[PDB]
Design a protein around this ligand. Structure first.
Ligand SMILES: [Zn+2]
Lengths: 329, 567
């Protein structure tokens, strides 16, 4: 479905279809030689991160082509150190964090120059503590997140002004307990994920009003059992992941109906083909396949490896590098 | 990615491959290639503009192409006449609005439009304010255009009462809308409010009355709308002091001063530390958290030397200053007193319920009478039912405590997906009521038996409590925030669902711990009691850790100092 308010669940998939999801991602880049593969080239490095991460959560990373990915990544670092979504595109903190997350998965970080990544991240910090996405200046708390995430995985959170960074993120906290992209922007789930992730990485979760924010986040559950990203929007598997992660992070995961959300996410699977879509009966893609899998894992699904609600990566990968932010309780 | 119906593109559309419009993708790739080659050759001309406008016109999120248009346009400013550059800019503006119609939430497109406008000597802001009005009538929940409005308003100066101005003219035949209440939630506090000290409301009572009545007409005209209710919850609730140390306590016997803050804080960090003045003369002390780790904490303490308590004067006087805000807690500890303190009541020191003037009580109480009436029209309206609860609370926790409980049960049957939030919220409010009952009666015993508690809240307000009955509830853990309970001697927590008892650690005066009939599974969950310096009676009867070894001897080696361990 789709209403203004929500979707109706039509007696369809109520089972986890793991083999199908794994065939979907494996052969995703091999479907052809056209499509959005060309038109999504501007986010490719993130798309590779989504397909690697979901494969590994599902225990099936070895089905993917490490070597070529490793060649791809090295070729997207620019001499300033930032990495681009793809070959010839401009560097950006988004794709910088994706590249670092992929090389963490493959324990192959020094495929790229790591002091360079750092100095790229340092250069984006503004006077007030914020981070621009790249030299052209857009300020967003999503990049505060990307900055501190990227450095955490590299062990260099010290390289930026962590105090001022913290101060800018907290100056984006709203009357509903959530956060916007800059001061005065409205709360929404993606933005609350970036911020609570940020505050987790920098040990500031005691600054969050868990009860108020956790209330706001649990109110994203619609009668279908899906979550939306803010009031009056349709449920979506990506907002549901962002909300679920934020709830775990702030100690409020039990405020959601877990069984209904399980059902909803299971209903977003494409029985034929594999993959998950934003909502039931829609077209699947890798981004929603990652969040369908990560959310299930966060809801308790033992087949799936435990995923971090901060990093969206297998918790065993992060343990291994010793990077496990402490969450609320 | 979003909204793509899975229709005719599936292995069952009896129209195999025929996956063309790669004519479009070849065109796309060549065009892309050709831009990239121009750029490295340093050819920053209108040819890059034409080729990127083809590619961004179909995909406005190819961010690298915005960078390329910026490099050309920058280049051209110093080669074009002023009127040639003025036509390029107009053309750029219309090309941007077209690209926003392709994707009204394209980050790179909007930032490209901020880049251009912030570099004009003299922009036409009406063009811009009208584009916002357009993208908002097509989608009132597009928050990108609300941000773009704040951009216009800051660039043009637009002073902050003229902008609220705007929102007014939108409370009527406009609409609802999380985005306009959000905006007023930022505008008002900028424009009026002066948090002086004593009385604790969100808005100058003056504006907080009317901004209530505002969102009233909005939730009355459409109950089944949520922004109004969300914003109304904020309006009821507390400004936060911060200038609040809320308790200080000294124990002669422990030789320790303990303090509790309103929010978890790190003493001695960026903006604050505690200074101690004892007998009106300074005392250098090392502050710590009960666990000695020094993380953010509501509760901090320090050791006192014998000279701060000795019998050299019949009194000591202990003034604590937190320098972040400059708020002050003095307690005075008399000749033979074991303890002394100074505490913030829930009661007078507005710890969580706003004190009401006659005027404010009359409007909230009238909106009491209103939400019921509405409830009879719309009995399954969950927002009305929560706001009735929240309206009792502002109003008089104590007396409408019975009604509160019945309202919670109704709302839980009406909104079962939040049943766990609602039990937790009801627990919080019952613990608040109990603190009023304890303080009202002036004792140090808190009674929270049979309250169907599922979580504990406000524990930093319990620093002086000596006896806590939590028995017969549905608690699953005694959380680490229980470390604020510095005077607790007797904790009766039998008959709950406890499976973790970590926050009993570091409790300095806890002598008796009753944990009968709980869910303590594997012994081992008992390990933390090792750090309880005074524990003398540990009752673990009714837990399944009791069928463990000859258990009454593992526990003796775990807990050699605990005199009586009942399994
Ligand atoms: Zn989505």
């Amino acid at each position: 479905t789709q209403q203004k308010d929500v979707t109706i669940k039509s007696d369809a998939p109520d089972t986890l279809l793991l083999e199908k999801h794994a065939d979907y991602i494996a052969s995703y880049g091999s479907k052809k030689d056209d499509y959005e593969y060309c038109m999504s080239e501007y986010l490719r490095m993130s798309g590779v991160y989504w397909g690697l991460t979901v494969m590994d959560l599902m225990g099936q990373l070895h089905r993917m082509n490490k070597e070529e990915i490793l060649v791809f990544i090295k070729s997207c670092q620019h001499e300033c150190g930032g990495v681009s979504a793809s070959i010839g595109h401009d560097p950006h903190l988004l794709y910088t964090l994706s590249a670092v997350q992929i090389l963490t998965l493959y324990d192959s970080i020094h495929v790229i120059n790591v002091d360079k990544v750092v100095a790229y991240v340092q250069s984006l910090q503004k006077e007030d503590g914020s981070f621009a996405g790249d030299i052209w200046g857009e300020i967003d708390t999503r990049f505060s997140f990307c900055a501190v995430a990227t450095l955490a995985l590299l062990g260099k959170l010290d390289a930026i002004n962590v105090e001022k960074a913290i101060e800018f993120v907290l100056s984006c906290m709203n009357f509903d307990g959530g956060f916007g992209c800059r001061p005065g922007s409205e709360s929404h789930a993606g933005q609350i994920y970036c911020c609570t992730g940020f505050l987790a990485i920098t040990s500031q979760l005691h600054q969050v009003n868990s009860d108020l924010l956790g209330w706001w986040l649990c109110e994203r559950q619609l009668p279908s059992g899906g979550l939306n990203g803010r009031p009056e929007k349709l449920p979506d598997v990506c907002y549901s992941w962002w909300v679920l992660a934020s709830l775990k992070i702030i100690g409020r995961l039990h405020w959601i109906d877990r069984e209904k959300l399980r059902s909803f996410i299971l209903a977003c699977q494409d029985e034929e083909t594999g993959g998950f879509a934003d909502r039931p009966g829609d077209m699947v893609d890798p981004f929603h396949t990652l969040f369908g899998i990560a959310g299930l894992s966060l809801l308790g699904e033992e087949q799936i490896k435990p995923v971090s609600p901060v990093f969206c990566m297998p918790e065993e990968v992060l343990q291994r590098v010793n990077v496990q932010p402490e969450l609320v309780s | 990615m979003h909204g793509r119906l899975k229709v005719k593109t599936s292995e069952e559309q009896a129209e195999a491959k025929r996956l063309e419009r790669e004519q479009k993708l070849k065109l796309y790739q060549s065009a892309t290639q050709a831009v990239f080659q121009k750029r490295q050759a340093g050819e920053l001309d209108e040819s890059v503009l034409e080729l990127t406008s083809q590619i961004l016109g179909a995909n406005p999120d190819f961010a690298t192409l915005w960078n390329c248009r910026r490099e050309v346009l920058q280049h051209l400013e110093t080669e074009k006449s002023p009127e040639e550059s003025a036509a390029l800019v107009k053309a750029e503006l219309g090309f941007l609005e077209s690209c926003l119609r392709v994707n009204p939430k394209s980050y790179g497109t909007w930032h490209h439009r901020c880049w251009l406008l912030s570099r004009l000597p003299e922009p036409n802001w009406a063009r811009e304010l009208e584009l916002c009005a357009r993208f908002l009538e097509a989608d009132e929940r597009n928050f990108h255009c609300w941000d773009y409005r704040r951009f216009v308003a800051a660039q043009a100066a637009v002073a902050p009462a003229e902008e609220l101005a705007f929102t007014d003219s939108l409370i009527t035949r406009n609409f609802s809308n999380y985005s306009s209440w959000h905006y007023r939630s930022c505008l008002l506090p900028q424009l009026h409010p002066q948090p002086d000290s004593g009385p604790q409301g969100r808005l100058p009572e003056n504006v907080l009355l009317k901004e209530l009545e505002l969102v009233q007409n909005a939730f009355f005209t459409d109950p089944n709308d949520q922004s109004a209710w969300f914003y109304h919850r904020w309006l009821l609730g507390r400004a936060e002091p911060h200038d609040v140390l809320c308790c200080v306590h000294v124990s002669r016997e422990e030789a320790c001063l303990s303090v509790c803050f309103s929010r978890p804080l790190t003493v001695g960090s960026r903006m604050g530390t505690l200074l101690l003045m004892v007998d009106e003369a300074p005392l250098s002390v090392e502050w710590r958290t009960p666990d000695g780790r020094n993380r953010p904490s509501h509760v901090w303490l320090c050791d006192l030397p014998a000279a701060s308590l000795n019998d050299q004067l019949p009194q000591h006087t202990f003034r604590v200053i937190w320098t972040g805000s400059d708020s002050q807690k003095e307690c005075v500890l008399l000749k033979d007193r074991p303890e002394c303190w100074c505490r913030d009541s829930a009661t007078d020191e507005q710890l969580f319920r706003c004190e009401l003037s006659v005027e404010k009580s009359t409007v909230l109480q009238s909106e009491l009478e209103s939400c019921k009436e509405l409830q009879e029209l719309e009995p399954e309206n969950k927002w009305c039912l929560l706001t009735i609860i929240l309206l009792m609370r502002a109003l008089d926790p104590l007396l409408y405590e019975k009604e509160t409980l019945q309202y919670f049960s109704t709302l839980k049957a009406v909104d079962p997906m939040r049943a766990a939030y609602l039990d937790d919220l009801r627990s919080k409010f019952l613990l608040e009521n109990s603190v009023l009952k304890m303080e009202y009666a002036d004792v140090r015993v808190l009674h929270l038996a049979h309250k169907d508690l599922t979580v504990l809240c406000h524990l930093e307000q319990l620093l002086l409590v000596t006896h806590l009955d939590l028995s017969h509830n549905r608690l699953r853990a005694l959380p680490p925030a229980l470390a604020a309970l510095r005077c607790l001697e007797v904790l009766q927590a039998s008959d709950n669902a406890l499976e973790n008892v970590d926050g009993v650690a570091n409790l300095p005066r806890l002598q008796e711990l009753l944990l009968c009939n709980n869910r303590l599974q594997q012994s081992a969950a008992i390990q933390p009691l090792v750090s309880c310096p005074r524990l003398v009676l540990l009752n673990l009867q009714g837990n399944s850790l009791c069928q463990e070894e000859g258990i009454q001897e593992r526990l003796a080696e775990m807990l050699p100092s605990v005199s009586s361990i009942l399994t």
